[PDB]
Amino acid sequence: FEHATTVPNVPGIPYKALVERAGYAPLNLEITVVSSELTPSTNKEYVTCKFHTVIPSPQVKCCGSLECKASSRADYTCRVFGGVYPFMWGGAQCFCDSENTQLSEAYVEFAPDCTIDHAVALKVHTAALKVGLRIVYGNTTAHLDTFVNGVTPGSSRDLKVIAGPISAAFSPFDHKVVIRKGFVYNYDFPEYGAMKPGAFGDIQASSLDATDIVARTDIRLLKPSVKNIHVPYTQAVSGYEMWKNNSGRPLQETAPFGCKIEVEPLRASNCAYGHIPISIDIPDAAFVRSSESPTILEVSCTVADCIYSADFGGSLTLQYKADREGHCPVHSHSTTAVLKEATTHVTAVGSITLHFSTSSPQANFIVSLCGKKSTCNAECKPPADHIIGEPHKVDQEFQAAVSTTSWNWLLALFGGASSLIVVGLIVLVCSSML
Amino acid sequence: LRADATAEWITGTTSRNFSVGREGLEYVWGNHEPVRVWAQESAPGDPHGWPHEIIIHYYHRHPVYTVIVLCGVALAILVGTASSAACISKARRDCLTPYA
Ligand SMILES: *[C@@H]1O[C@H](CO)[C@@H](O)[C@H](O)[C@H]1NC(C)=O
Ligand SMILES: *[C@@H]1O[C@H](CO)[C@@H](O)[C@H](O)[C@H]1NC(C)=O
Numbered sequence: 001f002e003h004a005t006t007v008p009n010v011p012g013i014p015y016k017a018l019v020e021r022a023g024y025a026p027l028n029l030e031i032t033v034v035s036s037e038l039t040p041s042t043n044k045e046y047v048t049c050k051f052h053t054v055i056p057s058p059q060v061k062c063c064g065s066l067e068c069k070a071s072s073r074a075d076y077t078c079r080v081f082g083g084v085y086p087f088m089w090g091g092a093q094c095f096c097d098s099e100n101t102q103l104s105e106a107y108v109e110f111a112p113d114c115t116i117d118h119a120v121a122l123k124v125h126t127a128a129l130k131v132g133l134r135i136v137y138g139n140t141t142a143h144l145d146t147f148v149n150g151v152t153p154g155s156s157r158d159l160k161v162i163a164g165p166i167s168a169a170f171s172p173f174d175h176k177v178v179i180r181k182g183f184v185y186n187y188d189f190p191e192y193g194a195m196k197p198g199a200f201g202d203i204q205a206s207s208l209d210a211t212d213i214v215a216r217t218d219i220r221l222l223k224p225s226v227k228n229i230h231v232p233y234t235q236a237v238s239g240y241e242m243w244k245n246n247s248g249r250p251l252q253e254t255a256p257f258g259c260k261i262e263v264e265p266l267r268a269s270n271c272a273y274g275h276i277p278i279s280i281d282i283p284d285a286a287f288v289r290s291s292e293s294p295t296i297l298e299v300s301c302t303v304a305d306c307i308y309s310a311d312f313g314g315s316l317t318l319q320y321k322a323d324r325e326g327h328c329p330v331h332s333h334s335t336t337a338v339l340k341e342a343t344t345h346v347t348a349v350g351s352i353t354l355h356f357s358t359s360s361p362q363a364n365f366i367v368s369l370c371g372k373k374s375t376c377n378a379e380c381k382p383p384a385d386h387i388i389g390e391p392h393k394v395d396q397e398f399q400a401a402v403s404t405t406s407w408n409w410l411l412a413l414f415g416g417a418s419s420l421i422v423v424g425l426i427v428l429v430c431s432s433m434l
Numbered sequence: 435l436r437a438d439a440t441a442e443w444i445t446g447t448t449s450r451n452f453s454v455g456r457e458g459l460e461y462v463w464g465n466h467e468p469v470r471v472w473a474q475e476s477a478p479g480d481p482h483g484w485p486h487e488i489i490i491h492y493y494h495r496h497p498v499y500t501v502i503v504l505c506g507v508a509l510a511i512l513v514g515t516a517s518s519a520a521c522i523s524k525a526r527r528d529c530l531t532p533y534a
């Protein structure tokens with residue numbers, strides 16, 4: 001038997017329904033989202049870290065011209081200075097008076113500690129939601145994982161559940177994502193080969209051990225002022241360090257719908273944002289015939305101290321005079337009130353107590369025991385506790401959040417105004433007919 | 435949908451107020467685990483009682499909705515009274531115009 005329903009995306013908060021075939025006893029269907037994740041498809045643009053500036057040993061040629069060629073090194077900057085007179089410990093360094101030339105080199109590479117402190121730039125595509133479902137049908141429990149895409153069946157051969165497309169697409173990650181040490185940021189890094197000095201991604205490579213490193217740090221070589229053999233140079237600050245200084249807060253703290261960002265792979269787990277259509281092909285072995293289940297001769301429902309809140313606030317008692325002892329499901333036929341218990345054991349005569357959670361100020365709903373309705377009818381009070389540590393199990397909706405003796409006043413005033421309209425109209429017609 | 439995230443370094447002994455809605459709010463304090471809280475409809479009134487208690491209870495929960503409902507019912511009774519008065523006045527002058 002195939003049953004289609006719609007569950008909330010909130011992790012935890014089990015969803016209850018009952019399945020009623022024409023010739024079979026109803027059974028409880030119990031759909032719980034125990035876990036979820038929203039993993040986008042990522043491709044790595046580059047890696048980056050704080051660069052290490054390598055200044056090689058200077059070249060000195062004693063009154064003979066020097067020039068330097070192009071190099072494949074990362075941000076290779078070169079300059080030649082003529083008319084030098086270098087000195088080291090020991091004395092002068094060339095045999096020639098004032099035509100001596102010095103060639104100064106400079107480039108960058110990865111720091112030795114980039115194996116730990118480094119950032120990875122990613123472009124992420126549309127994310128797919130995969131949920132872990134606990135399905136209790138009758139009294140059989142199955143745990144599975146399914147993709148929320150509309151056509152892929154769940155990971156269960158004996159149940160064949162299909163999760164329909166998600167109500168809305170959330171995708172907490174922006175198009176460009178930076179990951180550093182498990183911290184995830186929505187940063188718009190520059191493209192590969194488009195380095196900017198003093199900003200993030202000033203040095204880039206395909207991997208940490210890659211040899212094709214490219215960088216555009218603002219390095220420049222100065223003419224040596226004193227006559228030692230140092231290489232004077234000025235460079236822009238490390239754009240990786242500059243980004244670390246003002247990275248802001250990661251997406252683990254700034255992400256809607258209260259779901260936590262995890263790496264390896266990049267994903268957002270336990271997001272509560274939409275509604276998932278779920279279709280279950282319940283096997284016929286789970287069903288039982290209507291004659292097998294105990295029957296209800298009469299049943300009455302009395303609600304005692306209904307308190308509308310997020311937890312299971314409110315209790316009701318079903319008094320029944322059933323036939324033969326047996327277990328049968330119970331349900332609340334309302335979208336504004338959900339029971340706590342699913343199946344109960346009934347005897348020849350007695351009363352059973354159930355706990356329910358509602359978002360409406362009145363307990364005005366139909367409770368079915370063994371498939372037999374009971375139409376519970378009472379009032380509920382606003383809660384005393386302002387703040388609770390669990391989410392609401394029932395969505396709040398109009399026409400139920402407004403109670404009677406508040407609907408009564410509105411209907412009375414509207415009916416009075418309409419009564420004045422009708423009496424004015426009929427007196428006008430009576431005057432016109434004369 | 436709107437994660438109004440705040441981050442602040444606290445020194446000394448202070449107090450911080452945070453508005454919590456039905457969707458909930460989490461706070462992390464130092465190295466502690468995140469703590470999640472949710473707000474209930476605990477408005478200081480009475481949905482089943484005299485009308486002023488109902489109005490203040492539903493005004494603390496959803497202000498603008500109840501204000502426009504009150505404006506709508508006031509407009510409805512005003513238009514109904516005015517139209518009924520106009521109709522009965524027209525009928526009265528139509529019945530008394532031959533006698534005059
Ligand atoms: C389900 O309940 C029925 C009646 O209570 C019982 O006979 C049966 O063994 C139960 N099934 C399982 C799998 O526990
Ligand atoms: C940058 O770093 C300096 C010292 O490292 C610090 O004082 C400053 O607050 C940081 N942030 C900005 C935005 O300048």
Ligand SMILES: *[C@@H]1O[C@H](CO)[C@@H](O)[C@H](O)[C@H]1NC(C)=O
Pocket residue numbers: 449451
């Ligand atoms: C925080 O809220 C309480 C109760 O609403 C109030 O008494 C207090 O003044 C508020 N504190 C601040 C700093 O606004």
